[model samples]
Target chain A: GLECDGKVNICCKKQFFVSFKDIGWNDWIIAPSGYHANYCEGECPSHIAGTSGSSLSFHSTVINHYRMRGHSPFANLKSCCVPTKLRPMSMLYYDDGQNIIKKDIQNMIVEECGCS
Target chain B: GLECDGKVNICCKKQFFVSFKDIGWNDWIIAPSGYHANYCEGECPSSFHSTVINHYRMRGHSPFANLKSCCVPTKLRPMSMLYYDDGQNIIKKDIQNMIVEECGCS
Candidate 1:
C-alpha cells in the first residue's frame, strides 16, 4: 500500500534501469545494451496541505483530487506517473538484413516526469 | 487579436460550429448537418490576485508558474447524432464528450 500514511506522498522522478538483455532484445543491440531511463512514482492525495511545488499538471491535479475523493464518474481512475519530457538517444542495432546501423532513437530518455 | 486587453484574461468557453457537410461527412450523416462543438479560449496570466478557487492548483505555486495555465474544457456533454453505418443501417446514438459545456483555466 503506497497510499498516504502520515507522510507526504509527492510524485517525483525515480531511478530506473532498462536492460535490453533482460528484456531479450540484446541480440541486435551492439553497444550500450541498457540505460538509466528514470520513471515517475508516488501517490497523489486529494488535498495537498501547505504551499509547495508539484510536478502535477493542472488537469491532473483537479482530476486526481476528484478521483481520490470518489466524487467524479471516473472515481476509479488514479493519477498515473508518466514522462512529460523526453530526449533522443543514439543506438547501434542490426537491421533485418543483418546490417549494423546507428541512429538516434526519438524519445528514448525521460527528461521529466509528471502526473497525468 | 484575441489576446489580452486591459481586463483580466480569464479563460472560458466559446461557441464553435462544426459542419459535417462542410467536412464532406454529410453523405453518411442523415440529420443535422452541423452542430456547435464549442472550444476553449483565452489566457492565464501569471500571479492571479484576489484568492479564489480555480481549475488549477499546486502546480501554479511551483517554479513552473511561468508556464502559466491552459484553457481546457472543464465539463463536457453528449450530442445525439443520426448517421448511416458501414452496413447502411440508420443509427441514432449519443456521442460522448462531443459538446463542451464549460471551459476553465487549468
Candidate 2:
C-alpha cells in the first residue's frame, strides 16, 4: 500500500511470471495462496506472504495411494480454510503449484487471505 | 515355471492392468520391483516378484523422495544374485517371502 503511484502497478508478487510446472510447491503447499497483483512501489501484503510462502496440499488420492501401498507420500501439511491477508500475490503464484494462468490476468485475493 | 497349460499364463504378477496413476508406488519404492504378470496357476517368477514387490527407482526430483529417499527395509538382506535374477525361483521365493511378509501388498 505504499506510494505505487500508477494507481495499478503489478502486485508485488506478480512482478515475475513464473511458469506452472516449473514452480515449486513449498510455498503454496496445502491451500490456495490467493491472488497476487503486479507492481507495488511499497510493501504489499501479497508480496510479504509470497516472500514467506508456505507449502502445498496433497491430493487425497495421491496420499491414499501411497498409504494403501504402504508407502509414505508427501508430508501431512493441512489446508488453510480461509486465505490470510497482508501478503503479495506472488506468494500465491501457482494454483496448486501446478496450474497456469492466462498472461492477461492479475493475481487476486477472493478472501482476505486468512490462515485456518 | 509351472506347466501353465497354454504357453504362458502370464507372469502371474502382470495379470492386472493397473495404470501408472492407478498403480500405487509402495510396491515399487526406491527400486524397480521388476515386471509383474497375470494368470499363473503354477506360480510364475514375476508373480512372486510382484507379490514380494518393493519400491521403484527414485530420481532426485521424485516428489516422493522429497523428505527421505532410501529407507532401510525392516527385513534387510544382502543383494544376492538370486534376489536380482528371475531364474532363481527358490532364492527369489525366499526373498519374495521376506518382502511379502514384511512389506505386504502394494
Candidate 3:
C-alpha cells in the first residue's frame, strides 16, 4: 500500500462555507444568512524550501529547513496553512437591545492563503 | 511622567528597507540595489480584540480563545529583480513575499 508523503503535499486555499442558520445564529443575523468563507489547507513540503517564488514566508522557509533536517528543538515545528489576505464583509445583525445594526465586519473573508 | 501604554498602541506597518549591497548580495542582484520592505509593528490591545471577525473566531469563546493576537503582515506582493544564479547566469523574475502590502492584527 502507498503511504502519504510530502511530495504530494502543497499548501493552498480550499473552499468552505459558513451559514448562520446552521450555527443557530440565524435569529440574530438578518442579511445574507450565509457566506462563502473559504479556508486554507495542505502541507508544506521541504522540497519547496528556500524557493523565493513559493508562498512560504521567510520565517516558514527557515523553520521548514530546520524541521526537515531534524535540527534541535526546531525539528518539531511545522508550517501552518493560514489566510494571508482577508477582506471585510458587511453584516446586518441585531444587538442585545433588539436594534438592527449594519456594520462592516473585518476579516470575514479569506482572500488569499499561504503557509506560515 | 508619561510611559508607553496599550492605549496609544496600534497594530500597523512601519517603513523598512532591504539593500542587497548591505547584505553582500549586490554582486548577484543586478537590478535595484535596494528596496523598501516595510514591516508590521505595534500591539494587539485587548480592547480591540473580537470586534467582528477572525480575531473573534480565534479569540472569542473558541477552543483557542486563550491565544492572543499579534500584529502581522496580512498581505504581501512580489518584486521583480534581476539576479545571477549559482551557475553565474543572469535571471530576472518576480520574487514573491518581498513586499508587505498591508498589516493587521491576527
Candidate 4:
C-alpha cells in the first residue's frame, strides 16, 4: 500500500491478543489473529499488501500493563483484536503476534529462543 | 493472626509464585511458601493457633514437581502446612480433610 503522503509503503505490521480466560487465579492470556499486520525485512508478506483507509493509517489499541499470571478464571474470554494502522515510517519490524510496547520489542526479540 | 490492628484474628493469607523454570516453552510456575499464612475455620490447628504470625512455611531446598494442573503451569516441590483447595465434587469437610492430609497444618 502507498502512503497517504503519496509515499511508497515501507511495510505494515499489527498485533493484538485474542480471548482471555482465567485458570486457577491467574488471568489466562491467549492470542488469535484478526487483520494483524507487520513488516518482514526477513521477507515481508503482502497479507496486508494494500492501502487501508487511503491514508497509511495507524492506531494503537489499549494494552494491559499489570497482566495476571494465567488464563482468566472463566470459561469464555472474548477476543480484543487491534487492527494495524499502516503508516509512513523508516526502519521497522513486526513478528508473530504482539500486545506489547515499542521499546520492549527489542528485549522481546532478545528473549526469543525455544526450550524443551 | 491478627490484622495488625489487634482486631480479633480473622486470618492473614499470603500467596506468591516460587520460581520460573520454563517447561516445553512454558515458564514453569511453582509455589513453595517461605512465610505463607491462612486460617482454617474447618478446624483450626494449634500449629497455627492461639498466637499471631500464623504462617505456613514450605521448603524448596531441592527440586520436584507436584503435577497439579490449573492456572499457570505450576509444579510444587516437597512441602508442608495447611493449604486451600476449591473442592467442588466431594463433601466440603472431606475436601478440607483431603488438603490437610495432602499437606496441611504442619
Best by DockQ: 3
TM-score of chain A of 3: 0.70
> How many Å off is the CA of A62 in candidate 2?
2.9
Q: How do the residues A31-98 of candidate 3 rate in per-residue lDDT, one tens digit apiece?
A: 87988876554554556432322445643443444557687544543334456666788989998876
lDDT of 1 by residue, A63-83 (tens): 444456676343743333344
Model 4: per-residue lDDT, tens digit, B1-106? 2222334333222232212122121221122222222112111233101010122112221111211111110111223323234542322221111111111211
Q: Best candidate, TM-score-wise? A: 3
- State the lDDT at A113 in candidate 1: 49
Writing each residue's lDDT as its tens digit, candidate 2 over B1-106 gives 2223356533211131223324654233323333221211222121111111112113343422322211111121222212333342333222221111111111
Question: What's the DockQ of model 3?
Answer: 0.10
Q: What is the lDDT of candidate 2?
A: 0.26
Scoring each candidate complex against the real one, what DockQ results? 0.02, 0.02, 0.10, 0.01
- Considering just chain B, what TM-score does every model have? 0.70, 0.20, 0.76, 0.15
Best lDDT among the predictions, by candidate number: 3
C-alpha root-mean-square deviation, candidate 2: 23.4
Residue B41, candidate 1: C-alpha displacement in angstroms: 25
Candidate lDDT values, in order:
0.53, 0.26, 0.59, 0.19
**Winner on lDDT (1 vs 2):** 1
Q: What TM-scores do the predictions have?
A: 0.40, 0.16, 0.53, 0.13
